[model samples]
Target chain A: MLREDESACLQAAEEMPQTTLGCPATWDGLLCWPTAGSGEWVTLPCPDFFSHFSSESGAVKRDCTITGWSEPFPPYPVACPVPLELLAE
Target chain B: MLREDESACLQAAEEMPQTTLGCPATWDGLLCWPTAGSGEWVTLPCPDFFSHFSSESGAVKRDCTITGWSEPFPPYPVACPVPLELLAE
Candidate 1:
């Protein structure tokens, strides 16, 4: 079960037709978005993604419960999935 | 597993401590990040969320593999998870 807020962000940004946006552990690359925007992107495989960064991270576990994040540490950024059409928007 | 690019984004963005981040179908809420920023936030329950907007949609599935998204249509947005500290940045 995912979070409501995360779901909202995902719908607003990620979730495309050609690919989905997520780390190697949580999703497939085809759906992951690649844009000429600013910020860093990362990927992981399955439980490892959750173990190393998400459910197991002590930095964020105090408050959050992310399934898989782009970063390995705590304190992540905010980015909406960009549709090619809205890039200029 | 998730994609490499997506994982990078998650690390830099989502995967918070209080909340993990992701739709109801993918993550829990405690880890879901909440912000006073712009954009519409939506919530869903279990596969139902995917059924309503993600995996069920024919618009994006044509090209993408999103586990879920904020919107229920084809083109999604590009937004990074905002850490409360970076709101002013």
Candidate 2:
């Protein structure tokens, strides 16, 4: 866990604005972030969620709704803040 | 080129969106990307300028018109998107 690795997942989740959904990507009994499934535990809640990570151990990832686009799978790709992945090497 | 690497060396350069204006940054016989100067090609424009990294041989890097702030630089260090360095290795 890079950002507050030992911190409670829910308290960390609350600091962010609710604009998207984040899930705990788990791997081998440990939570993991995207692009870093084996390296650390990550949490995603919004496209631009912030997490305090010294490395990739605990990263928080999120997906956000694209602001400018229509429905039925909006004309634009949902905006994705650069995935803030963390690692603990 | 992870992104579109081997495509448009550039409609102008006849190279793949790949312009190593950063001094062909030559290594082996291969005109390469920032990290893999011996493997692939890459280029950078502005931090957000899109490029086509076939694998990493060539990449386009650029420092841009950072917004906000004023000073020896600014109270705020300009923001940099993740370096778009390509990878052939």
Candidate 3:
């Protein structure tokens, strides 16, 4: 299986803030992080489309520090897992 | 292998214009399309993360019309094929 594709993150990058002393809006190949002031947190609902999960349940969060969105969704190796139908081949 | 992950496209969706009388920005689970006037064409350089391709070359094009971006990169099944190392497991 695969994870959410990169295109989704690319789309989010455009709308989020940039150049903020805080964590600027950014996409880390998994989730989109909007501008959040340092010391704040951003919560993103996990996206739907995976076989084992639903968009309505579960979420991933990151902290906005002076550096950036905390490690781009730490604690999880990937944002989500998706079905790769052809893997058996 | 997987294609460019969805996060990448999500980032693209944010930056592109929305609600244009023309074709508004959209993510087709593969690529991010920006606002374009009807009858205009949008050309995007293929992303560089795939194992077989380089970001420096190749492009995908879509047409913008009253309906919307053309087929979201017709003629190709996916935006880019990505290496999924764990499939061997």
Model 1 alpha-carbon drift over 4 Å, by segment: A13-17, A20-70, A75-89, B1-89
Q: Which portions of model 3 miss their true places by more than 4 Å?
A: A1-12, A15-18, A51-56, A72-74, A77-89, B1-89
Give the fraction of true interface contacts kept by model 2: 0.00
Best by lDDT: 3
Cα lDDT tens digits for candidate 1, A16-48: 445433322222222222221122233222222
lDDT of 3 by residue, A1-89 (tens): 12444565666666555555777666665456677775555667565444355344444566564555555332332345344563443
Evaluate all candidate structures by whole-model CA lDDT and list the values in order.
0.29, 0.26, 0.55
Task: For each candidate, report what fraction of the true interface contacts it reproduces.
Answer: 0.00, 0.00, 0.00
Q: Candidate 2, DockQ to 2 decimals?
A: 0.03
CA lDDT, candidate 3, residue A69: 56
Predicted candidate 2 versus true structure: per-residue lDDT over A1-89, tens digit per residue: 43444244445445655554333322211222332211112233322233332222222222211221111110111221233353222
Of 2 and 3, the candidate ranking higher by TM-score: 3
TM-score of 1: 0.15
